Amino acid sequence: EIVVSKFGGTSVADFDAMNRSADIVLSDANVRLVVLSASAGITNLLVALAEGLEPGERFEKLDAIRNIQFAILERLRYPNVIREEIERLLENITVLAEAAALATSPALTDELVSHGELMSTLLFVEILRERDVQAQWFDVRKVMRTNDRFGRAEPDIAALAELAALQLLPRLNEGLVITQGFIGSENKGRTTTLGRGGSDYTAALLAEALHASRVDIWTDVPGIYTTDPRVVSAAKRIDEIAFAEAAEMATFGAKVLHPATLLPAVRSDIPVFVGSSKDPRAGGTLVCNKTENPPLFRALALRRNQTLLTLHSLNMLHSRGFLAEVFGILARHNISVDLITTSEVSVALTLDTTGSTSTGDTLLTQSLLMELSALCRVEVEEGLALVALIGNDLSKACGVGKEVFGVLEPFNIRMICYGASSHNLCFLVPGEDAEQVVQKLHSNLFE
Amino acid sequence: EIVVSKFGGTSVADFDAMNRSADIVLSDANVRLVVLSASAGITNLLVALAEGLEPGERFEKLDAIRNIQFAILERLRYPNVIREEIERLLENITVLAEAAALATSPALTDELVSHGELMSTLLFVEILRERDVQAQWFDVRKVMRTNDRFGRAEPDIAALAELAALQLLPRLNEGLVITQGFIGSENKGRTTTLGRGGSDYTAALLAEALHASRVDIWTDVPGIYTTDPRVVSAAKRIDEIAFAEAAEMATFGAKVLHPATLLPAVRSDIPVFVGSSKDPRAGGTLVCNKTENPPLFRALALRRNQTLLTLHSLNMLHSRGFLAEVFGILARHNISVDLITTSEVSVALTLDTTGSTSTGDTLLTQSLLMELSALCRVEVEEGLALVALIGNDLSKACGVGKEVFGVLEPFNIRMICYGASSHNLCFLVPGEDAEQVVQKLHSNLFE
Ligand SMILES: Nc1ncnc2c1ncn2[C@@H]1O[C@H](COP(=O)(O)OP(=O)(O)O)[C@@H](O)[C@H]1O
Ligand SMILES: Nc1ncnc2c1ncn2[C@@H]1O[C@H](COP(=O)(O)OP(=O)(O)O)[C@@H](O)[C@H]1O
Ligand SMILES: N[C@@H](CC(=O)O)C(=O)O
Ligand SMILES: N[C@@H](CC(=O)O)C(=O)O
Ligand SMILES: [Cl-]
Ligand SMILES: [Cl-]
Ligand SMILES: [Mg+2]
Ligand SMILES: [Mg+2]
């Protein structure tokens, strides 16, 4: 019986916002664990610095980073103590940025980028104690154990359970606990990150590990809509939806949720709430086990910068293996594909961006290619965008093909993958036409 | 420089037909090799007998078989010699049918069914010599070596080359040679068959092995149409088309050609002609390397009684393997799939009928299932029909989705697989609505 609350960039971008969020945490006494991302802009600045920047640009970034932190600092009642700390963090960030300028790696990046959520959670506790509140700071790294895959580390569920009950539970009993999402620590103590947007994932993870009654995702939009409001102005809010529905929404482009948030949700039936931190009375969306009478079409999701890796065979093995093998190469290079389409011995692979914390993460390695290039002719098309329609029983229902492609006459559909799930129908279209399609569909579909 | 001609059931169903076909062979002196299927109805009768029938029904079948053969026999000039032989064949067919009534197997079936093309080719030579023609009978089994996969044996290309030049070439130099398609012999002398419609395949095979200038397919329809004339009355004939186009037409339902006919065609660039044996002046379709300015939509193909094997995971291995493995099971059971569609860890498999000479060939074995059932939840939907659209550059062209699904509003599209080939777009629909769909499409597409 403990609700876990999560606040994103915008929700803790500055003192005021941080306050709006602090209020919310104190509107419900069941909120015992808070999860914060770093303030808006921090992570991008930090990532640009882990790329290795020259003296000039480097200094600009470090200052943009220091400003944001002091905007908040200079508003506190007793800014002396945390100033020391911030200075260390800032100073350390500085030395790391100097190192990045000479050598860089996904591990250095995770370590430097981790600093954002560290500074944000330190300040938040201060904003909470400035109100006479028992609120203590906690380093998730003591609990969030992950593998050594830097940039997008994967959580060790068992480990996260023992630890959380041995170091985090007692702290929850005593009082309030503020910690950071997105980061973790590997076996040999090195810092890791779960991948962009990972703060959502962290919230669901600790919720499961602590047997919480619920998780609250506080963002900059009141709930989950029928599509990105930034693309469809006329986007309608969705008051309530179910796990797999949303699970697939996130997976195909519903940025509001990290594609891995709901895994723990489903595994422990921990409903998740989604609302605006700047307007908690507009009302958000609740994600739960199962709904009332689920529509046929809930929403549309867009996933940009997709890559289409089409594989034809140099005709040397039998399809059985030609495939069984092809899939045993991606098993080594551990390249996961959400969408595949075939035609005899021609297999078109739909590749999503990494979502890794480190920019330079390049999916198609030359080792891979030459291994595949000889085993079967390769093809790679870029600047393609995936469009997904999520609903229910689309496979055993009528009029789906006409309803979706009746408006797309003027476009080039490059790939259509449908039939594997009664919840979705996806397809590719050239990047530039991406949004106009989302609009056209949504229109004669939800409006 | 030798043209190879092939005649199907209807084309040698009876004396007259056999004659029509004999004429055609003598309208071109480059025709040195003729390939005959058994007379219409024979193979089905023979297959029903290899299933094991009781005394009564068995006797009816043997008589329907003897009648058809005597209809031709009783019209010859000197019917005495071949009568002896036919009697043996008939007698042997009889004893085999008696054995089938007690024990049955794909090997007994191939051996009994082989008898059809044996009787037809024996008579044809007689129809040719009744016209003072140097025409000799030849047993393809001496040359058509295949593996031991009875019901749908696979040709050993190398072996077929050495043999054909050592036993068949000399016979072609001397004069005319009549032999049988559809059948072969395995390593240990046992008789095999290439699978229903395999007589087309045989024609292409020997053409490649003998370095022929061409192959002529004589059927009961003047050329290759934009779709089965038996479904679309308004079906238009296609005067000329290219390998991959047609290759895919056959593969997805264009019965006029066995799905494996063009493999040798492509491998040796041996153009293939397709015309009616009852009307050689209506004109047929020529299949060659490449065309003029290939349409965007050539035709539609229907493949009935498809099975949709959808695989969801019991969530115990990582997608990489979950797939890499799934495909390494079908690699053992050697289950080939032309059409696959995925969605994360859910993979929907499109399964075609065996096309095997033996009816009882059941694709989904219980060994397989329980091996798959535990590794990942299974699903099986039957009575589904595949619809394919063949053309050119459908992937990098516009309006494809609207053009195809604009008419199918009233239907349930169950699977859409597209993007792997710039030549086709396929999809499933419940069996009963199959033809009405083919008609609706073809209409606002070719008419
Ligand atoms: N279907 C959808 N419903 C609601 N928001 C969506 C949807 N698809 C995309 N979004 C976008 O995701 C945003 C919230 O994500 P994010 O920027 O990561 O914030 P946070 O820091 O709170 O995690 C919304 O502001 C919106 O731009
Ligand atoms: N696209 C198509 N073009 C021409 N015929 C087709 C097509 N699709 C299917 N067919 C069918 O295939 C038939 C010929 O095949 P088949 O019955 O095996 O004869 P054969 O014994 O000559 O091989 C046609 O009579 C027609 O019913
Ligand atoms: N702070 C990380 C993680 C998150 O926002 O959830 C980022 O900016 O992507
Ligand atoms: N005679 C076999 C092979 C063929 O017709 O091509 C059958 O009836 O299917
Ligand atoms: Cl940022
Ligand atoms: Cl038959
Ligand atoms: Mg986020
Ligand atoms: Mg045939």
Side-chain angles (χ1 to χ4, degrees), chain B residues 6 8-9 37-38 43-44 117 181-182 195-200:
Chain B
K6 183 274 191 169
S37 292
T43 295
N44 297 327
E117 352 296 297
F182 177 57
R196 303 313 300 264
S199 289
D200 290 319

Side-chain angles (χ1 to χ4, degrees), chain A residues 189-201:
Chain A
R190 302 186 285 172
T191 309
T192 57
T193 62
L194 307 156
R196 303 313 300 264
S199 289
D200 290 319
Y201 193 20

Side-chain angles (χ1 to χ4, degrees), chain A residues 324 327 340 342 344 395 397 412, chain B residues 324 327 338 340 342 344 395 397 412:
Chain A
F327 296 60
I340 298 189
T342 64
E344 293 188 69
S395 56
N412 170 68
Chain B
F327 296 60
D338 303 303
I340 298 189
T342 64
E344 293 188 69
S395 56
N412 170 68

Side-chain angles (χ1 to χ4, degrees), chain B residues 9 43 74 97 100 109 184 246 276 398 426:
Chain B
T43 295
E74 297 171 355
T109 286
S276 182
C398 287
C426 319

Side-chain angles (χ1 to χ4, degrees), chain B residues 201-326:
Chain B
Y201 193 20
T202 299
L205 296 163
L206 302 150
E208 158 168 45
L210 293 176
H211 319 300
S213 357
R214 180 187 42 170
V215 169
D216 283 321
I217 303 308
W218 292 103
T219 176
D220 70 354
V221 142
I224 303 173
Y225 287 48
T226 58
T227 200
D228 195 314
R230 310 190 180 194
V231 206
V232 182
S233 326
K236 323 297 180 188
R237 181 235 265 79
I238 298 177
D239 301 307
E240 190 182 60
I241 190 172
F243 288 147
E245 275 173 279
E248 275 189 35
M249 281 192 78
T251 301
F252 297 127
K255 185 178 194 292
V256 273
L257 294 193
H258 181 84
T261 316
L262 305 173
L263 283 181
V266 172
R267 295 206 301 270
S268 284
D269 202 78
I270 299 177
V272 172
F273 175 70
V274 187
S276 182
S277 61
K278 300 188 174 185
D279 189 34
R281 50 187 47 171
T285 303
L286 177 129
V287 178
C288 52
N289 203 179
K290 281 166 273 66
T291 32
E292 190 68 356
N293 299 310
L296 186 64
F297 304 143
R298 280 275 193 188
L300 302 172
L302 172 73
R303 207 166 74 186
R304 288 222 157 234
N305 313 312
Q306 304 296 290
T307 307
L308 181 71
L309 182 63
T310 300
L311 291 183
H312 300 284
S313 65
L314 280 184
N315 185 264
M316 61 185 76
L317 306 168
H318 59 177
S319 89
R320 339 304 163 76
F322 175 70
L323 297 185
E325 186 49 31
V326 159

Side-chain angles (χ1 to χ4, degrees), chain A residues 6 8-9 219-221 223-225 227-230 249 254-256:
Chain A
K6 183 274 191 169
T219 176
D220 70 354
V221 142
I224 303 173
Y225 287 48
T227 200
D228 195 314
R230 310 190 180 194
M249 281 192 78
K255 185 178 194 292
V256 273

Side-chain angles (χ1 to χ4, degrees), chain A residues 154 247-248 251-252 308 310 312 318-321 323-325 327-348 381 394-403 405-421 424-426, chain B residues 154 247-248 251-252 308 310 312 318-321 323-325 327-348 381 394-403 405-421 424-426:
Chain A
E154 300 162 37
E248 275 189 35
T251 301
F252 297 127
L308 181 71
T310 300
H312 300 284
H318 59 177
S319 89
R320 339 304 163 76
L323 297 185
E325 186 49 31
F327 296 60
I329 305 184
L330 316 174
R332 314 189 192 317
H333 297 66
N334 260 181
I335 293 180
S336 182
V337 179
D338 303 303
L339 296 172
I340 298 189
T341 240
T342 64
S343 180
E344 293 188 69
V345 281
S346 320
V347 42
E381 308 199 4
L394 309 178
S395 56
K396 293 197 170 190
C398 287
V400 173
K402 185 278 179 182
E403 205 55 290
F405 308 82
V407 198
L408 319 175
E409 167 178 24
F411 307 121
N412 170 68
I413 304 192
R414 178 71 180 84
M415 189 282 302
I416 306 183
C417 184
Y418 168 55
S421 179
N424 84 64
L425 183 158
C426 319
Chain B
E154 300 162 37
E248 275 189 35
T251 301
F252 297 127
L308 181 71
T310 300
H312 300 284
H318 59 177
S319 89
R320 339 304 163 76
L323 297 185
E325 186 49 31
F327 296 60
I329 305 184
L330 316 174
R332 314 189 192 317
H333 297 66
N334 260 181
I335 293 180
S336 182
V337 179
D338 303 303
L339 296 172
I340 298 189
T341 240
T342 64
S343 180
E344 293 188 69
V345 281
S346 320
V347 42
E381 308 199 4
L394 309 178
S395 56
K396 293 197 170 190
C398 287
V400 173
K402 185 278 179 182
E403 205 55 290
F405 308 82
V407 198
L408 319 175
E409 167 178 24
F411 307 121
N412 170 68
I413 304 192
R414 178 71 180 84
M415 189 282 302
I416 306 183
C417 184
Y418 168 55
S421 179
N424 84 64
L425 183 158
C426 319

